[PDB]
Each structure stands twice: as structure tokens, then as C-alpha cells.
Design a protein around this motif. Structure first.
Motif, PDB file in Angstrom:
ATOM      1  N   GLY B   1     -50.015 -53.029 -15.538  1.00  0.00           N
ATOM      2  CA  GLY B   1     -49.716 -53.374 -16.960  1.00  0.00           C
ATOM      3  C   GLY B   1     -48.670 -54.814 -17.189  1.00  0.00           C
ATOM      4  N   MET B   3     -48.802 -57.348 -14.375  1.00  0.00           N
ATOM      5  CA  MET B   3     -49.151 -58.607 -13.403  1.00  0.00           C
ATOM      6  C   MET B   3     -49.144 -60.035 -14.037  1.00  0.00           C
ATOM      7  SD  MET B   3     -51.786 -56.807 -10.619  1.00  0.00           S
ATOM      8  CE  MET B   3     -52.764 -56.732 -11.711  1.00  0.00           C
ATOM      9  N   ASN B  49     -51.952 -63.669 -13.738  1.00  0.00           N
ATOM     10  CA  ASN B  49     -51.480 -62.866 -12.796  1.00  0.00           C
ATOM     11  C   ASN B  49     -51.201 -63.888 -11.413  1.00  0.00           C
ATOM     12  OD1 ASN B  49     -53.980 -62.932 -11.204  1.00  0.00           O
ATOM     13  ND2 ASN B  49     -54.372 -61.240 -12.366  1.00  0.00           N
ATOM     14  N   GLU B  50     -50.735 -63.233 -10.278  1.00  0.00           N
ATOM     15  CA  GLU B  50     -50.345 -64.084  -9.261  1.00  0.00           C
ATOM     16  C   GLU B  50     -51.718 -64.548  -8.659  1.00  0.00           C
ATOM     17  OE1 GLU B  50     -48.220 -62.060  -6.467  1.00  0.00           O
ATOM     18  OE2 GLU B  50     -47.937 -63.588  -4.870  1.00  0.00           O
ATOM     19  N   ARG B  51     -52.770 -63.933  -8.652  1.00  0.00           N
ATOM     20  CA  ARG B  51     -53.804 -64.618  -8.135  1.00  0.00           C
ATOM     21  C   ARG B  51     -54.566 -65.719  -8.927  1.00  0.00           C
ATOM     22  NH1 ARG B  51     -58.737 -66.742  -8.696  1.00  0.00           N
ATOM     23  NH2 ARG B  51     -58.942 -65.588 -10.623  1.00  0.00           N
ATOM     24  N   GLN B  52     -54.414 -65.662 -10.231  1.00  0.00           N
ATOM     25  CA  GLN B  52     -54.833 -66.532 -11.189  1.00  0.00           C
ATOM     26  C   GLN B  52     -53.924 -67.782 -11.047  1.00  0.00           C
ATOM     27  OE1 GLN B  52     -54.594 -64.210 -14.636  1.00  0.00           O
ATOM     28  NE2 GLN B  52     -56.977 -63.692 -14.551  1.00  0.00           N
ATOM     29  N   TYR B  54     -51.943 -68.836  -8.648  1.00  0.00           N
ATOM     30  CA  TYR B  54     -52.003 -69.422  -7.224  1.00  0.00           C
ATOM     31  C   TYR B  54     -53.437 -70.258  -7.227  1.00  0.00           C
ATOM     32  CZ  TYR B  54     -52.730 -69.915  -2.308  1.00  0.00           C
ATOM     33  OH  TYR B  54     -52.804 -70.462  -1.025  1.00  0.00           O
TER      34      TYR B  54
END
Lengths: 81, 81
Positions: B1, B3, B49-52, B54
Motif C-alpha cells: 500500500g 510503494m 513506485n520504484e519501477r515507475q 526508475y
């Protein structure tokens, strides 16, 4: 090889809010029927890559009694099964 | 909830400084090749979030002519593409 940065840790969380959160994390537009209700719990044991997180979401929703179908323009629609 | 908690608000900052700041936020050591230079401004519209986050970083750098290569021991290498 994809980066494993996706986690989940929900206890008795509102299912609609969970769905919205996951959708956002996957860059999907979310359409939900009015039947989508109740609570869900889910805790990942280890971080996941994006595809594995998507798969977890699908498998979880199926187990909850929800049908999940992709629609045009990056939509996921979730309705009672 | 939780990220989607990465943010960026950079105006007229050195590209190298931006790269270093992203690295710190991702807990990654930056290796920079020669000739990494420029100025950048960038602002997130909603938390990522981390992927987004990065991926935003990668997309920005690629537009500038740079590639990113993860390496061992939590390194990101930035070199000319």
C-alpha cells in the motif's frame, strides 16, 4: 532478469482500494462494477518483478470471486465472477 | 500500500547532480562515464513506485543520449548511449 521491486502487504484491506492501488502500480486504467466489495489480505514473501506482480493480482482476484478482463486503452475491468 | 512514494522536483539542476540524487533515492552507487553533462528540470505529477521512477529516470537519460547499466553491488552505470 527484470527488476524485482513489487511487494504487497495488506491485511483486511478494502478490496476496491487494493484494486485501485495495484492498477496504479501497473499503469492500468481501472473499471470496477458496483458488485466489487469486501476485504482482502495478501503478503508477498519476496519482491516480485512487474509481470509476477500482475500474475499475483490476477490469481488473487480469481480466487476472490472476481472476473478481470482487459479492455481497450490500457483498461482492466474487474467485476463479480 | 506504500510503494508509490517516490517523487521528483528539480529545476535547473546539473544532470550529474540529478543522477546522484536518483541514485541516493534508489540506494544505488553511481558510476559515470566521461562526458555525462547537462541541465535538467523534472517534476513528477503523482507519486511513483520504484519501477515507475526508475523508468522515468531511464527515459529522461535516453533522451539526453545516455544509457543506464545496472551493475553488481547495487551500482548504476551511466554512459553515453
Amino acid at each position: 532478469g527484470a527488476m524485482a521491486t513489487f511487494t504487497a502487504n495488506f491485511k483486511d484491506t478494502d478490496l476496491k482500494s487494493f484494486i485501485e492501488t495495484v492498477g496504479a502500480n501497473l499503469n492500468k486504467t481501472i473499471i470496477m462494477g458496483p458488485g466489487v466489495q469486501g476485504k482482502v489480505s495478501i503478503r508477498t514473501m519476496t519482491p516480485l518483478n512487474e509481470r509476477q506482480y500482475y500474475q499475483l493480482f490476477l490469481n488473487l482476484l480469481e480466487a476472490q470471486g472476481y472476473a478481470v478482463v482487459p479492455m481497450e486503452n490500457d483498461v482492466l475491468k474487474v467485476v463479480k465472477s
